[PDB]
Amino acid sequence: EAVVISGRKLAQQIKQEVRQEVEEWVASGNKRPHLSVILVGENPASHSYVLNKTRAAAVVGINSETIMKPASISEEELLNLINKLNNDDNVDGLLVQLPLPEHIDERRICNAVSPDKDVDGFHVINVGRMCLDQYSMLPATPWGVWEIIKRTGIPTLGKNVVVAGRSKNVGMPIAMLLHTDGAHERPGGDATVTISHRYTPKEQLKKHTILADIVISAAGIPNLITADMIKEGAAVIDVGINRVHDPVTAKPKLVGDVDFEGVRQKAGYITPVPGGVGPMTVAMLMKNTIIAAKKVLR
Amino acid sequence: EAVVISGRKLAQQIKQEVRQEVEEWVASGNKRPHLSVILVGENPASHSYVLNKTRAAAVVGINSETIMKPASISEEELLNLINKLNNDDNVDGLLVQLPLPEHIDERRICNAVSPDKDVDGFHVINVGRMCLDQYSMLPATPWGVWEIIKRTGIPTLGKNVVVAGRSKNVGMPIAMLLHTDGAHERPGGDATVTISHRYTPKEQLKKHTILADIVISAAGIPNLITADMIKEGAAVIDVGINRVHLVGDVDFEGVRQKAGYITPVPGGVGPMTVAMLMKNTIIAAKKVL
Ligand SMILES: Nc1nc(=O)c(CC(=O)Nc2cnc(C(=O)N[C@@H](CCC(=O)O)C(=O)O)c(F)c2)c(N)[nH]1
Ligand SMILES: Nc1nc(=O)c(CC(=O)Nc2cnc(C(=O)N[C@@H](CCC(=O)O)C(=O)O)c(F)c2)c(N)[nH]1
Ligand SMILES: Nc1ncnc2c1ncn2[C@@H]1O[C@H](COP(=O)(O)OP(=O)(O)O)[C@@H](O)[C@H]1O
């Protein structure tokens, strides 16, 4: 039966580390780090998630604010705000919670944020640098997945890894980190990586996961991954956060992409949803904010 | 036996497309495109390849010059030259042939070329845009591999593909093009892609290639792919160009029984590399950023 990795405990340890580091930075008489978060509209998940981020900033010694804007705001208005904050020498990190409404182009917004305040790592320069194995602001969810693997001592060099999902801020950067050279400026995990997506036929997915020492599911599909697909002792990391309705009572429940109960038999490791990858995302963003405050990637 | 794909012939087709496009463009008022190539040192592969590029330029009606410099050139000189060429409005495309001498930072050189004139697609912005499936200057070898697959009619959507190698200008971009979404601004092939490299155990490689409708080898290792690694009827694309006693990364002679399609070396991907660069030069001349 599978060791269950608590991403909540790990995230909490990492927050303690950022706390000490912020205490230190300030005791040396530096400006306290400041994170600004922009939230557009009323997606409830977006609200909960931004709540989690600002709390985390509070508890690790980072000053936060959330600027909430109505969904009817124009792209131009959002850009004027971004520009104010890029020019405010008090703001170390600046993030815009996603998704944005359809009249606003996310890519133009992500590229408007100053690369050295880009704690999400979504600016095209950060994406380019990451894809070239250079130092960059790494994106929080993928770096969280990496820390779960690395801090649990699960090896990656030479190993087979499958990532279900190819989204530009989750699946793609996860696949990039895991396959790349450990000897490079930004080290990778030297694994053999397969990437699947919405057109991977389910039988062919299974044919690749069955060979996998590590399966990382970032598709947003309940019960995508089941124990017949996993091999004995493999690590299984679950990036999905899927809001379902619970058969016994149609209560609103969070599952991931893995059939936890089925897979926790056969697997060597497993993360739960909730309390797995999600809090790690919040922890790695605290890390990026301290990094941005210390202006080390200038 | 396997259908042997002629890169020589597909490249001919592409170069005729560019010739026509260039001729309409000049005919309708515009400056004739110009490609400037910077060559440093005496690597015989580099010299041969830069000659192939400028010949192709000449025959599709694109003006060229190669600027040859000694290996001894300093990084500051090379950047000075690049800066001059970035400002010369006669120059549409600018490329610096690799590899550069060990005392020159390649990445610094690559980022110094104006993105508008970056016909190799090695500038960090071009790499970033490509990884986001945005319009970009696609790198020549990866776009060549893509054109080989799509002009030969080999399907990719839902299919299994293995790329052997993860170099930033070949193997990584090939994997990026093949797995990405056909509906995006810069379409991809909607395939299921495995990337392998110098730490993939050979048996594990084989366990992936066995499943593969397409195997693309960009490792630079003679005989890495052998017919027991292929599944019958599969497309094998050989990006390797190795000096031994020129051959690929495939055992051509063996794999051609088992394979559905196969590319030779020479005459496969290499001539396509040259062709796609001509494509990129006319795209740069037209200033469709
Ligand atoms: N600019 C930008 N950047 C981004 O990074 C992201 C991604 C992101 O914020 N992800 C998450 C994920 N999970 C949590 C979390 O708290 N998860 C808990 C459950 C809490 C509950 O159910 O409400 C868990 O999974 O246990 C979080 F705070 C943030 C977006 N959308 N936008
Ligand atoms: N900035 C930059 N950009 C780059 O794109 C490249 C890569 C590159 O130039 N690739 C190639 C590959 N092959 C050929 C070729 O003509 N191959 C013939 C064999 C001819 C013979 O040497 O006898 C074949 O394979 O049939 C070519 F002209 C260029 C580099 N290095 N640098
Ligand atoms: N056994 C192997 N299987 C797959 N890829 C390999 C193997 N051995 C080496 N490689 C890869 O080949 C590449 C060598 O780089 P390079 O020669 O610069 O690229 P190219 O083949 O495009 O010229 C590296 O990415 C390396 O990890």
Numbering used by the authors:
A (entry chain B): 36 to 333
B (entry chain A): 36 to 280, 289 to 332
Authors' description from the paper:
The folate metabolism enzyme MTHFD2 (methylenetetrahydrofolate dehydrogenase/cyclohydrolase) is consistently overexpressed in cancer but its roles are not fully characterized, and current candidate inhibitors have limited potency for clinical development. Indeed, the one-carbon metabolism enzyme MTHFD2 stands out as the most consistently overexpressed metabolic enzyme across human tumors. MTHFD2 enzymatic function supports rapid cell proliferation during early embryogenesis, after which it is replaced by the mitochondrial protein MTHFD2L in healthy mature tissue.
The tool compound TH7299, as well as two of the most promising candidates, TH9028 and TH9619, were chosen to investigate the MTHFD2 mechanism of action and cancer biology. Furthermore, we determined the cocrystal structures of TH7299, TH9028 and TH9619 in complexes with human MTHFD2 to assess their binding mode and identify critical interactions in the binding pocket. In the present study, we show that, in contrast to the characteristic promiscuity and polypharmacology of antifolates such as methotrexate (MTX) and pemetrexed (PMTX), TH9619 displayed high selectivity toward binding and stabilizing MTHFD2 over other common folate metabolism targets such as dihydrofolate reductase (DHFR), thymidylate synthase (TYMS), serine hydroxymethyltransferase (SHMT) 1 and SHMT2. We could confirm MTHFD2 stabilization against thermal degradation on incubation with TH9619 in cell lysates and live cells using CETSA, demonstrating intracellular target engagement. To evaluate whether targeting MTHFD2 was responsible for the observed toxicity on MTHFD2 inhibitors in cancer cells, we generated MTHFD2−/− clustered regularly interspaced short palindromic repeats (CRISPR)–Cas9 knockout cells and found that they were several orders of magnitude more resistant to TH9619 than parental MTHFD2 WT cells, but not MTHFD1−/− cells. TH9619 shows very good solubility and metabolic stability in combination with low plasma protein binding, but also poor passive cell permeability that is probably explained by the low lipophilicity (cLogP: −2.25) and large polar surface area (239 Å2 (23.9 nm)), suggesting active transport over membranes, probably via folate transporters and/or receptors. Furthermore, TH9619 was comparably potent against mouse MTHFD2 (half-maximal inhibitory concentration (IC50) of 66 nM), indicating that mice could be used as a model for safety and tolerability studies.
